[PDB]
Amino acid sequence: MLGLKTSIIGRRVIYFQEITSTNEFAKTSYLEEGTVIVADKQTMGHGRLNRKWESPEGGLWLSIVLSPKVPQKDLPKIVFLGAVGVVETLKEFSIDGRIKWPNDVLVNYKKIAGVLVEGKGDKIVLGIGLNVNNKVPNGATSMKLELGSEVPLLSVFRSLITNLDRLYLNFLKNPMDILNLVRDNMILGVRVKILGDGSFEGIAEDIDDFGRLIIRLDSGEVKKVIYGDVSLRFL
Amino acid sequence: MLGLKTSIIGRRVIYFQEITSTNEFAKTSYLEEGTVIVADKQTMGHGRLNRKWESPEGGLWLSIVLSPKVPQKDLPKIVFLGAVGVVETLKEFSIDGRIKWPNDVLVNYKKIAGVLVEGKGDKIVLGIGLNVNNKVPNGATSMKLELGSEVPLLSVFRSLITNLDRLYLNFLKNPMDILNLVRDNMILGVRVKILGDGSFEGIAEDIDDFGRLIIRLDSGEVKKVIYGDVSLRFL
Numbered sequence: 052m053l054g055l056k057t058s059i060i061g062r063r064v065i066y067f068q069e070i071t072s073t074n075e076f077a078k079t080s081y082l083e084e085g086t087v088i089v090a091d092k093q094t095m096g097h098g099r100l101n102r103k104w105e106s107p108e109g110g111l112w113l114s115i116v117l118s119p120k121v122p123q124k125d126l127p128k129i130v131f132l133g134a135v136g137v138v139e140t141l142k143e144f145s146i147d148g149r150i151k152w153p154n155d156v157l158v159n160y161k162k163i164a165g166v167l168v169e170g171k172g173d174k175i176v177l178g179i180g181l182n183v184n185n186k187v188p189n190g191a192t193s194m195k196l197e198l199g200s201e202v203p204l205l206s207v208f209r210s211l212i213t214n215l216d217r218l219y220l221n222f223l224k225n226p227m228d229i230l231n232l233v234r235d236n237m238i239l240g241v242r243v244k245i246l247g248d249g250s251f252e253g254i255a256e257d258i259d260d261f262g263r264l265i266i267r268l269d270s271g272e273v274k275k276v277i278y279g280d281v282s283l284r285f286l
Numbered sequence: 287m288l289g290l291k292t293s294i295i296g297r298r299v300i301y302f303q304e305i306t307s308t309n310e311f312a313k314t315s316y317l318e319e320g321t322v323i324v325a326d327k328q329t330m331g332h333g334r335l336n337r338k339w340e341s342p343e344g345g346l347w348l349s350i351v352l353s354p355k356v357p358q359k360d361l362p363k364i365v366f367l368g369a370v371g372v373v374e375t376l377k378e379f380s381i382d383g384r385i386k387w388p389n390d391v392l393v394n395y396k397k398i399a400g401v402l403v404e405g406k407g408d409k410i411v412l413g414i415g416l417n418v419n420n421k422v423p424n425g426a427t428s429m430k431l432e433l434g435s436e437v438p439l440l441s442v443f444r445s446l447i448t449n450l451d452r453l454y455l456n457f458l459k460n461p462m463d464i465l466n467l468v469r470d471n472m473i474l475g476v477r478v479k480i481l482g483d484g485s486f487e488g489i490a491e492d493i494d495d496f497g498r499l500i501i502r503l504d505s506g507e508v509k510k511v512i513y514g515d516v517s518l519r520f521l
C-alpha cells in the first residue's frame with residue numbers, strides 16, 4: 052500500500068506504534084536484506100557507547116538490515132551512507148544539514164540526526180535517528196524547528212529510503228564513491244578535540260581513503276582518527 | 287512513522303512491495319494480534335476455495351492477525367467484521383457498498399471488495415481485498431472508477447484500519463452487535479440461487495443469528511445456508 056519503488060532498502064517495512072529499539076529488533080530478528088524497521092517512538096532508544104537516544108513521537112526512528120557484498124575493509128563507510136542519506140533528504144527540504152565525523156548530522160552546529168551501525172557477519176544494521184516534528188533535547192534541533200513549520204513525516208521517510216536505496220546500490224558497485232560525498236558535506240577546516248585514550252586537539256582537515264578523520268595538530272603533527280571508542284568535539 | 291492510533295489492529299504493520307499472499311504469510315509466520323500484513327502486489331492472490339484474487343498495484347491487499355478469545359460459535363462472524371469495515375470506509379469516501387452474502391461487498395452490484403478469513407491454530411487471519419486505483423476484472427469496479435479520480439491508497443488504509451479496530455474491540459465485548467450492522471448493509475429481499483450438489487433457488491430473506499443465509503424456496507420451505515463450498519448467485 053506504500054508503493055515503494057526502491058530496489059533493496061524498503062523491499063519490506065515493519066512499522067511499530069512503539070518499540071524498545073529498532074536496532075535491537077533488527078539485530079535480533081531474522082530479517083531479509085533491505086527490510087526497514089520503523090517506529091513512532093522508542094522506549095529504549097540507543098546511541099553509541101551505551102548512550103541513550105531520545106525518541107519521542109514526531110521524529111524518524113528507523114533501522115535497515117543490510118548484507119553488504121563488499122570487502123570487510125569498507126564496512127566503516129556504511130555509517131557515512133546513513134549520514135549522506137540524511138543530508139541529501141535535508142537538502143530536499145531546503146535544510147542545510149552538515150556531517151560531523153563520525154556519525155552526526157548538524158544544522159548550525161545543532162544535532163538533528165544520529166547514525167549507528169551495529170553488528171557484523173552477513174548482517175549489518177543501519178540505524179538512523181532524525182528529529183522532524185518531535186521535541187528535542189536542549190542544544191539539538193529538528194526539521195520543524197528549522198523550517199518554522201511541521202513537516203509530513205511520511206514524506207521525509209520516502210525521501211530518505213529513496214536516497215539510501217540509490218546510495219547503497221552504488222556503494223555495492225563503487226565502495227569509494229561515498230567518501231567524495233562525505234567530504235563535500237562534512238564540517239572541516241575548524242579546530243576539533245578528540246577524546247579517546249587521553250585526548251588531543253587540532254584541525255580536522257579531511258577524511259582519507261579509509262574514512263579516517265585527518266587531524267593536524269598545532270605541532271604540525273598529523274594524526275589519523277579511526278572511529279571506535281572515540282568522541283569528537285568542536286572548539 | 288505512520289502514527290496509527292489503533293488499540294489492537296495496526297499496533298504493527300508489515301509492508302511488502304511484493305508477496306505471494308498476505309493471508310498465507312500471516313498463516314505461516316508467528317505474529318502478534320493486531321499485526322497487519324499488507325502488500326502493493328500479490329503474485330498468488332487467494333479467494334475462496336481455489337479461486338484466484340487479482341492483486342495488481344494500486345489496490346489494497348491485507349490480512350490481519352487475530353485471536354479473539356470469545357465463544358467458538360461467534361468465530362464465523364469475523365468475515366462480517368471485515369465486510370462491515372470495508373462498507374464503512376467506503377461511505378467515508380462517499381461510496382455506498384452493499385454486502386453480498388457471504389464475503390462480498392458490491393457497489394451497484396459490481397464487486398469492489400472481498401473478505402477471506404482462514405483459521406490457523408487458535409490464530410485467525412482476516413484477509414481483505416479492496417480495489418482502489420488498480421485495474422479490475424471485467425464486471426468488477428474500484429473506488430477510482432466510482433469516484434472518477436485516483437484515491438490516496440494510504441488514506442483508505444488508515445480509514446479501514448481505524449474502522450476494523452473499533453469494530454473488533456466491540457466484537458470482543460458484544461459479539462452479537464456485528465450481525466445487526468450486516469443486516470442493515472446486506473443485499474436481501476432478492477431472488478438468488480445457491481449452487482453445488484443440491485443447488486436451489488429462493489428469496490434471500492435474512493441472515494441467521496449464526497450468520498447463516500435464510501432462504502425461502504418457492505415451496506415455502508426455508509433453508510439455512512452456511513458458507514462452505516456454496517456459491518451465491520443473483521438471478
Ligand SMILES: Nc1ncnc2c1ncn2[C@@H]1O[C@H](COP(=O)(O)OC(=O)CCCC[C@@H]2SC[C@@H]3NC(=O)N[C@@H]32)[C@@H](O)[C@H]1O
Pocket residue numbers: 071072073074075093095096097098099100102103104105106111112113114154155162163164165166167178179180182187188191192
Ligand atoms: N533526539 C535526539 N536529538 C539530538 N541529539 C540527541 C537525541 N537524543 C539523544 N541525543 C544526544 O546524542 C547522543 C547520542 O549520540 P551518539 O553519537 O552516540 O549516537 C547517535 O547519534 C545515534 C543515534 C541513533 C538513533 C537511531 S533511532 C533508530 C535506531 N534505533 C536505536 O535504538 N538507535 C538508532 C546522546 O548521548 C545525547 O547527548
Ligand SMILES: Nc1ncnc2c1ncn2[C@@H]1O[C@H](COP(=O)(O)OC(=O)CCCC[C@@H]2SC[C@@H]3NC(=O)N[C@@H]32)[C@@H](O)[C@H]1O
Pocket residue numbers: 306307308309310328330331332333334335337338339340341346347348349389390397398399400401402413414415416417422423426427
Ligand atoms: N481484484 C478483484 N476485484 C473484484 N473481483 C475479483 C478480483 N480478483 C478476482 N475477483 C473475482 O472474485 C472471485 C474470488 O471470490 P471469492 O468470493 O472466492 O473471494 C474473495 O472475495 C476474497 C478475496 C480476498 C482477497 C484478500 S487480498 C489480502 C488477502 N491475501 C490473499 O491472498 N487473499 C486475501 C474470483 O473467483 C474472481 O472471479
Ligand SMILES: [Mn+2]
Pocket residue numbers: 153154155165
Ligand atoms: Mn555522535
Ligand SMILES: [Mn+2]
Pocket residue numbers: 387388389390400
Ligand atoms: Mn464471494
